[PDB]
Write a protein that binds this DNA or RNA. Sequence first.
DNA 1: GACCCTTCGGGAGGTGCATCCCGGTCTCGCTTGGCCTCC
Length: 263
Amino acid sequence: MNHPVESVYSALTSILLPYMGEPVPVQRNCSCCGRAPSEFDGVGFELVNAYRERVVHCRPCQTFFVSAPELMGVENPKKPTTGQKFGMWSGVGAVINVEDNSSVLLAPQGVVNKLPEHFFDHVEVITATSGQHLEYLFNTELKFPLIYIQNFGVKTYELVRSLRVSLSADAIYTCADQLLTRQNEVLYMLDLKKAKELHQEIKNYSKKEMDIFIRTVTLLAYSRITPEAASNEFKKNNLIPLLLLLPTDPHQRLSILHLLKKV
DNA sequence: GACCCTTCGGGAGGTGCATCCCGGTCTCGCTTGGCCTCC
Ligand SMILES: [Zn+2]
């Protein structure tokens, strides 16, 4: 009930209830989220995946494995009778406003084309690829708390177990269907407040100065240039006030630099 | 049957010629249904 998968379900995949079906009561914890059945009210969906594994899904988890061609379009013409699945979407992002329960679907142009017009009524779909997700996050006024599924992907189990609610702009969790262990959440943490202030301060610097700053920071983060050389370049180009806004973590530096080079 | 006394100075390069060219890969880290066999 009080879990991110329920939030995304109610906001985004509660549009496919009429093609979902009646759950079959179960006694084991859902294999997809992994949470105990105490919050599923004792019921569940019994299902077999393409690897012939007996899998239980809860009401939120099962929505990712539902075929609704009449609502989500046909994903592959070679298999008409199965449609686009939220758990099989790769390169498709989604921002879930938990408090408002509204959702925006950042899908590429091909996915938008495959979606029937009935889908756009329930879900507001903006045409954007995986590269323009950060553009949408940057420009749009996000409402918190929210769940930012950067890439729905195909690893639905790792997407559900990666779902983290982003309470504020300081730490926006980019869930991209890769298991969000505490060891790789730095790659999936988007510090949009710092990125926005760094972009605001990038305006004071010339295009050449900002290209030099970005290249120096990227090379240093990959240990291609010595810190002495990078410091010399920063001092010669007067980029120290930019550096004071950088996180000390090189992976965070790379993430925010990707954000800057996208905007 | 004991020492003698051990040389100088020359003069020590010149050239030529330093290639052509190939030809730089497949992959794959996921799930699903369709189709094809087959216990
Ligand atoms: Zn579940």
